[PDB]
Amino acid sequence: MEVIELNKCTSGQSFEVILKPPSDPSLEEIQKKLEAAEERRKYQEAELLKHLAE
Amino acid sequence: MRECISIHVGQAGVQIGNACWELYCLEHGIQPDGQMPSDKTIGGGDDSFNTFFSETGAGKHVPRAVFVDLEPTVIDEVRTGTYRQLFHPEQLITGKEDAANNYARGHYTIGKEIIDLVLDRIRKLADQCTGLQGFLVFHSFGGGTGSGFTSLLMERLSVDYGKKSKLEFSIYPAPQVSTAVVEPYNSILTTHTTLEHSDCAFMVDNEAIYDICRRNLDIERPTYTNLNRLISQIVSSITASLRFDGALNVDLTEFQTNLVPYPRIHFPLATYAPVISAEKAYHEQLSVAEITNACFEPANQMVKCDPRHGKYMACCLLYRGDVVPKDVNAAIATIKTKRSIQFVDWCPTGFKVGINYQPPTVVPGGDLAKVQRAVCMLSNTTAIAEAWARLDHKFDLMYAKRAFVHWYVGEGMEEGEFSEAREDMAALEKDYEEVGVD
Amino acid sequence: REIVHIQAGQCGNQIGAKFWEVISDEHGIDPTGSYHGDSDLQLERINVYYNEATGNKYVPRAILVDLEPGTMDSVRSGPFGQIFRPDNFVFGQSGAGNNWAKGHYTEGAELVDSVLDVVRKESESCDCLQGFQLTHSLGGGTGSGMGTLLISKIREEYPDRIMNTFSVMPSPKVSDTVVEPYNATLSVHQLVENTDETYCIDNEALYDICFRTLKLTTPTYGDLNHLVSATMSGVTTCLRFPGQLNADLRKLAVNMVPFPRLHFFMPGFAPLTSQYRALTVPELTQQMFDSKNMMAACDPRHGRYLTVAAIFRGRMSMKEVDEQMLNVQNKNSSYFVEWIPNNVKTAVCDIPPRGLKMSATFIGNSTAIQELFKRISEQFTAMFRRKAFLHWYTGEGMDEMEFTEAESNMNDLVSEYQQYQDATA
Amino acid sequence: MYTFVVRDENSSVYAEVSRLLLATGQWKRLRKDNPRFNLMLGERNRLPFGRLGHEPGLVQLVNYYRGADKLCRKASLVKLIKTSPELSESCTWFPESYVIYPTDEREVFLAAYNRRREGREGNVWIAKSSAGAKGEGILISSEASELLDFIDEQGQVHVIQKYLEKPLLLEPGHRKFDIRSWVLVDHLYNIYLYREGVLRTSSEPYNSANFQDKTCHLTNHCIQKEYSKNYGRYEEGNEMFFEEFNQYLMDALNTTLENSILLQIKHIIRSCLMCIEPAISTKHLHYQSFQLFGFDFMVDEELKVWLIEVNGAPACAQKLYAELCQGIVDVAISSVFPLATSIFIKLHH
Numbered sequence A: 001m002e003v004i005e006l007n008k009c010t011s012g013q014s015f016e017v018i019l020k021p022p023s024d025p026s027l028e029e030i031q032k033k034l035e036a037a038e039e040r041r042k043y044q045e046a047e048l049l050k051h052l053a054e
Numbered sequence B: 001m002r003e004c005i006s007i008h009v010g011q012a013g014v015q016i017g018n019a020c021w022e023l024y025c026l027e028h029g030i031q032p033d034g035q036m037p038s039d040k041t042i043g044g045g046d047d048s049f050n051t052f053f054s055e056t057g058a059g060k061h062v063p064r065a066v067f068v069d070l071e072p073t074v075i076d077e078v079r080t081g082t083y084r085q086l087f088h089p090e091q092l093i094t095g096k097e098d099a100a101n102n103y104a105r106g107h108y109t110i111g112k113e114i115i116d117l118v119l120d121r122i123r124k125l126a127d128q129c130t131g132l133q134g135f136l137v138f139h140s141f142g143g144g145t146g147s148g149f150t151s152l153l154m155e156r157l158s159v160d161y162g163k164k165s166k167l168e169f170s171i172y173p174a175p176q177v178s179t180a181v182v183e184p185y186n187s188i189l190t191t192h193t194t195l196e197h198s199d200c201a202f203m204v205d206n207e208a209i210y211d212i213c214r215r216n217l218d219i220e221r222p223t224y225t226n227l228n229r230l231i232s233q234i235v236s237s238i239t240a241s242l243r244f245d246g247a248l249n250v251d252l253t254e255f256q257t258n259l260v261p262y263p264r265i266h267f268p269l270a271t272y273a274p275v276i277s278a279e280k281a282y283h284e285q286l287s288v289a290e291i292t293n294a295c296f297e298p299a300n301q302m303v304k305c306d307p308r309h310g311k312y313m314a315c316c317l318l319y320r321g322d323v324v325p326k327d328v329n330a331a332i333a334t335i336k337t338k339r340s341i342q343f344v345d346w347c348p349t350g351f352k353v354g355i356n357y358q359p360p361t362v363v364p365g366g367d368l369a370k371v372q373r374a375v376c377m378l379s380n381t382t383a384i385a386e387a388w389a390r391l392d393h394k395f396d397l398m399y400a401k402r403a404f405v406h407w408y409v410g411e412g413m414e415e416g417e418f419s420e421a422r423e424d425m426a427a428l429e430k431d432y433e434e435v436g437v438d
Numbered sequence C: 001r002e003i004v005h006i007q008a009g010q011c012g013n014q015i016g017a018k019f020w021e022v023i024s025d026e027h028g029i030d031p032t033g034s035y036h037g038d039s040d041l042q043l044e045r046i047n048v049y050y051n052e053a054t055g056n057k058y059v060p061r062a063i064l065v066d067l068e069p070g071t072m073d074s075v076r077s078g079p080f081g082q083i084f085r086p087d088n089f090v091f092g093q094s095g096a097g098n099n100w101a102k103g104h105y106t107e108g109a110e111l112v113d114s115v116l117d118v119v120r121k122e123s124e125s126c127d128c129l130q131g132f133q134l135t136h137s138l139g140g141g142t143g144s145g146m147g148t149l150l151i152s153k154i155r156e157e158y159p160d161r162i163m164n165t166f167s168v169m170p171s172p173k174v175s176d177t178v179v180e181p182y183n184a185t186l187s188v189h190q191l192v193e194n195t196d197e198t199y200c201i202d203n204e205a206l207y208d209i210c211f212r213t214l215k216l217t218t219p220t221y222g223d224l225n226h227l228v229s230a231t232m233s234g235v236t237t238c239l240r241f242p243g244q245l246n247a248d249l250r251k252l253a254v255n256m257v258p259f260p261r262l263h264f265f266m267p268g269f270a271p272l273t274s275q276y277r278a279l280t281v282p283e284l285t286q287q288m289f290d291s292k293n294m295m296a297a298c299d300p301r302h303g304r305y306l307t308v309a310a311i312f313r314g315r316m317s318m319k320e321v322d323e324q325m326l327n328v329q330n331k332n333s334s335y336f337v338e339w340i341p342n343n344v345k346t347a348v349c350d351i352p353p354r355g356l357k358m359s360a361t362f363i364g365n366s367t368a369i370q371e372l373f374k375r376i377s378e379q380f381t382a383m384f385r386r387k388a389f390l391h392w393y394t395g396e397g398m399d400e401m402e403f404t405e406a407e408s409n410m411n412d413l414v415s416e417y418q419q420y421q422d423a424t425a
Numbered sequence D: 001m002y003t004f005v006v007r008d009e010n011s012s013v014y015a016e017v018s019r020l021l022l023a024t025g026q027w028k029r030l031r032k033d034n035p036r037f038n039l040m041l042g043e044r045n046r047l048p049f050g051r052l053g054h055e056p057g058l059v060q061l062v063n064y065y066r067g068a069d070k071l072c073r074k075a076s077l078v079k080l081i082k083t084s085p086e087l088s089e090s091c092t093w094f095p096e097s098y099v100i101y102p103t104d105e106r107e108v109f110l111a112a113y114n115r116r117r118e119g120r121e122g123n124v125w126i127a128k129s130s131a132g133a134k135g136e137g138i139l140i141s142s143e144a145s146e147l148l149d150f151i152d153e154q155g156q157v158h159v160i161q162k163y164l165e166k167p168l169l170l171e172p173g174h175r176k177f178d179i180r181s182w183v184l185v186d187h188l189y190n191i192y193l194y195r196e197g198v199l200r201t202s203s204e205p206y207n208s209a210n211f212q213d214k215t216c217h218l219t220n221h222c223i224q225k226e227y228s229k230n231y232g233r234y235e236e237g238n239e240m241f242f243e244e245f246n247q248y249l250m251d252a253l254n255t256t257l258e259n260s261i262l263l264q265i266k267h268i269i270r271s272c273l274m275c276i277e278p279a280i281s282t283k284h285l286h287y288q289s290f291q292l293f294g295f296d297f298m299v300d301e302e303l304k305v306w307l308i309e310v311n312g313a314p315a316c317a318q319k320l321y322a323e324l325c326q327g328i329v330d331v332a333i334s335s336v337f338p339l340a341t342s343i344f345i346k347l348h349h
């Protein structure tokens, strides 16, 4: 049980106590999947208004 | 000095953020007007509190914060609250209609029409920063904005600020504070697409906060105001090292270094003590030993789980108030002989301790009693995976019948994202078990 | 977030009228549009249902539709008749003769464009249009045939807006003509496809309640309408009043509709009114869940709840509310599907309905509603197997195939509810 | 009323607890996967402890202690006894044992074996593991490489432990036995020892010479029901209960059962359960646990009691199922969910 890295200031102090030793998608890829979902939405909307047109 | 930008997303994120900044002003002595009498360098400075506050030539200290919600009801109260003139209009960003507790609606449909403007308002703040550290992102798991928009924002922040750190404060869904039945869906979906973009995430289960407020504050049915003021106490103790002089966790990167040996397992468990009701006139003040021992009672954790049946990989102790290093090590020595505290074999069994002498600040008239010393423990234990198991089980029950799925598909999401996000959580669950059980 | 209200036909206009009477009293608006209330939670969300006009007058966002002028002349002379915007009265003179085909295909077609003109004018003045609600019966010709035509046209022009209905289902015990099973079956198919939420108000249940519970030997349509306006006000409480619940029509639809076609709800209300004994929370929650209090003549014990919403009104200990709701769940946990965790939600609003210090409105999405659709389908088939009374419809241009398809779709919905009532975890 | 679920339908004991609870009129059974229960009669493996105590408005109780496996699986039993100061490498009532893998002590085993080598007195041991099902996989040898051969012959870790060569043998018969004591630990960690134990007998005469025949040496109930021809002659089912055994100890050795044996059993039960109490207690937890244990003891000719193993999912003697399962309801269940003398000995601590 040893203390380490004792730093002290006026606001407080810090230290470590050891008890025992041991033993991304690009912007274009984002915008495409965003627009791929938007197209799926408008396909769904087109099929609806076709159905309603029928 | 290096600056930190806070981003509050959705109702939960915004209301928690307003509770945190309220507390920050009380702690740093900033009035609702933005003026700070004790700040002697007018209109500038490199002090540690300026990591969270910029300064105007007129002496106003302005949060480095962005609020964003897809409906204006919540942010409008920020615009008309006690701290109304703390912020500028451009920091508050409103939509017209919200994500209706639909991840897909917040991520895909409504997200796309707002993400560019949010990033542009984030950019205005980052341009007023000499060296920017990264971001602290507040949000709910269950809201459609909190889950769907957050994950899109986090994706784009990794692209626009690839070398800056990103920390989350995430509200885990609890049915007792009114809950949409689809919050398990949104939680998993947002965790999956945010995981590789978040360096450290502090989960707060509303169930734990709710029961603490009932047990220790004797509030029979807590409100969001009761929950958020307690939450901000914890948040403040976690961020106090960023806003005050010190040597532990002075950098957002220190959080990952000190608490996250493996990137995917970046969900430290927070435990806080003491929580004492302000209606108790005199309360026998608890010692260093008694509040430190309370950090190992599940009843004080932000997430209900049993650390005894898992393994530790890191543990930080953040004290506020009258505390001396020797009291701490005396309290740790005794606690170790009495508690089941097993670390992973490939990690040192120890504690990183941080003490700030200023005791906790409490909102005048709030529910929390002033205390002479408090502690927040941040421990990365595999036991938190219990919370992933609960959420994943409910996800599984609803999804087996595809209940409510049509709401997400109808916004342009495909069913495959459901099982893709779920398989990611299945990997995360066994990541935890390989690390923590023999 | 504004809502546009539409009432079509005799039943739709008689029920809609009483709805505007009730809530206009709750929000403190007098029969001339002047607000004379005493609490400003009265007006925090008054824009949801009222347009603010000159001299701070409030005029309902209501469109009144019928194919004959009779009932709408009674509305205009009724108690709150002059509250309504005069240009929103849209009527013909021929009538619909209790004939779905006349309201949907011939007589209603001639008038529908005029209605949509008024709808568009109302929507154009909404800062954020939230959706539409429609009051109508399914057993007549205007509310049923033209009402579903309007819903189809509204969805074409506002495809991304929520459309809800309060739909009165016919019952042989309260019946005007023999063809009501035909008109209801054809209407249900329309609703399955084109509404987000439909509150099924069964005239059978409204009668039984009036007779067996409310002690009225000879129930009139006015007596059954009292219960409907009281339920409608309760169902819309959470949207009309500043509360902790921050939810629009879409959010509530999201939280109650697990499958698109299964959006037909069983409404309920407690206490049943026609008195001074204050009701205790435990009594409110038990009555609320009693089948004798549900306005759809279905036994909830014959099915399983997919979702449940409960809205309490008045000042009450919400701790005992949560206590009582959690206890009804746990004492009867088998009737709530286990593959939708935590599917019972609760809301509270401090302002009670006029005349009662406490009330509770029950909204249930139960698979037991299939009993209603089975009932209608049996009556439909009894005549259709002999093609009885079909000449009234073929003479308006319809073909027998359209009836066969409508019956098949309703028997499909029946089988859908039965699938999820047997489903397990 | 109260609600409960049953997720281990192979459990003789809680099948009877389940049926008695329903016969109370104030307990209702639900389907295994309904989460709105007050009590869980859980599965014995992969019990989802992490989903308990999160149902608003329901106090939840389960019939298993998360973490109790450390005591009821032989490999961890040995490791716990050796490494915990409360029990200590220097522990008198637990036989010399070593865990061997096919954290391994394969040769500190041989060191003690090569010490009994030196003084050339009884060097008999027995290898076994938790994978063995009613008497398969055991094997008793006198020389150590035949056992270690048998060790890696298969792929689950085993324990080597001193075979007690001079057991107390009942007469007439020259017969070995073991004692089973049933212990109930309730939600407050009271330790209740059931007043009624059983002695699982060997009806074969103990023979110190040949260890190959696996019947006069191995105690277990099915082995004697299956591969003993003379079984049941002395008592029914090779099961002697406490009154008979007490009377025998008085007539034969001028002593009592409590004085010569039970005092040591109660000491072993308490020290084992109190050792792990900090690790498994549910006193400040969001759900609570009780559990019934089966302690297996052996007695040597000096009337010294030895712990052999602890069983976390024990069966019971048929004659006492009724009394014991009723005691579970009173002490462990109704303790927490009340209705509208004592058969247990409370071991205070």
Ligand SMILES: Nc1nc2c(ncn2[C@@H]2O[C@H](COP(=O)(O)OP(=O)(O)OP(=O)(O)O)[C@@H](O)[C@H]2O)c(=O)[nH]1
Pocket: B009, B010, B011, B012, B013, B015, B016, B069, B070, B098, B099, B100, B101, B102, B106, B140, B141, B142, B143, B144, B145, B146, B147, B171, B172, B173, B174, B177, B178, B179, B180, B183, B206, B224, B227, B228, B231
């Ligand atoms: N602790 C806490 N939780 C909140 C608060 N507000 C909402 N929640 C929780 O968050 C969930 C609801 O998500 P919201 O944040 O309200 O939704 P949102 O992010 O605004 O997104 P939308 O669905 O578009 O409205 C529930 O689980 C609530 O328990 C809050 O102020 N404090």
Ligand SMILES: O=C(Cc1ccc(-c2ccc(OCCN3CCOCC3)cc2)cn1)NCc1ccccc1
Pocket: B178, B179, B180, C133, C164, C165, C197, C235, C236, C237, C238, C239, C245, C246, C247, C249, C252, C253, C255, C256, C309, C310, C311, C345, C346, C347, C363
């Ligand atoms: O839905 C209805 C009838 C109704 C009202 C209210 C509820 C309801 C109450 C509480 C709930 O739990 C809270 C979920 N939290 C929201 C905030 O985020 C956190 C999660 C969920 C649902 C359901 N159903 N709408 C009226 C209406 C109908 C027809 C025509 C006009 C208006």
Ligand SMILES: Nc1ncnc2c1ncn2[C@@H]1O[C@H](COP(=O)(O)OP(=O)(O)CP(=O)(O)O)[C@@H](O)[C@H]1O
Pocket: D095, D126, D128, D129, D132, D134, D135, D138, D161, D162, D163, D164, D165, D176, D177, D178, D217, D218, D219, D220, D296, D298, D308, D309, D311
């Ligand atoms: N160290 C030892 N010395 C002498 N005999 C022993 C012994 N270990 C076991 N025996 C004999 O072996 C028998 C039990 O072996 P084991 O411990 O493998 O039981 P089990 O766990 O296989 C059956 P259950 O757990 O279902 O009750 C003992 O009762 C005893 O008669």
Ligand SMILES: Nc1nc2c(ncn2[C@@H]2O[C@H](COP(=O)(O)OP(=O)(O)O)[C@@H](O)[C@H]2O)c(=O)[nH]1
Pocket: C008, C009, C010, C011, C012, C014, C015, C096, C097, C098, C099, C137, C138, C139, C140, C141, C142, C143, C144, C168, C169, C170, C171, C174, C175, C176, C177, C180, C203, C206, C221, C222, C224, C225, C228
């Ligand atoms: N509850 C209720 N039901 C009505 C009312 N008027 C008619 N009905 C029912 O609806 C049918 C008559 O339909 P109606 O609305 O009069 O036809 P429409 O005017 O052509 O739409 C019958 O089944 C009645 O049971 C009313 O005022 N209240």
Ligand SMILES: [Ca+2]
Pocket: B039, B040, B041, B042, B043, B044, B045, B055
């Ligand atoms: Ca300064």
Ligand SMILES: [Ca+2]
Pocket: A024, B158, B162, B196, B197
């Ligand atoms: Ca990154």
Ligand SMILES: [Ca+2]
Pocket: C110
């Ligand atoms: Ca004409």
Ligand SMILES: [Ca+2]
Pocket: C113
């Ligand atoms: Ca036109």
Ligand SMILES: [Mg+2]
Pocket: B010, B011, B069, B070, B071, B098, B099, B143, B145
């Ligand atoms: Mg919102």
Ligand SMILES: [Mg+2]
Pocket: C010, C140, C176
């Ligand atoms: Mg009529």
Ligand SMILES: [Mg+2]
Pocket: D130, D309, D310, D311
């Ligand atoms: Mg065993």
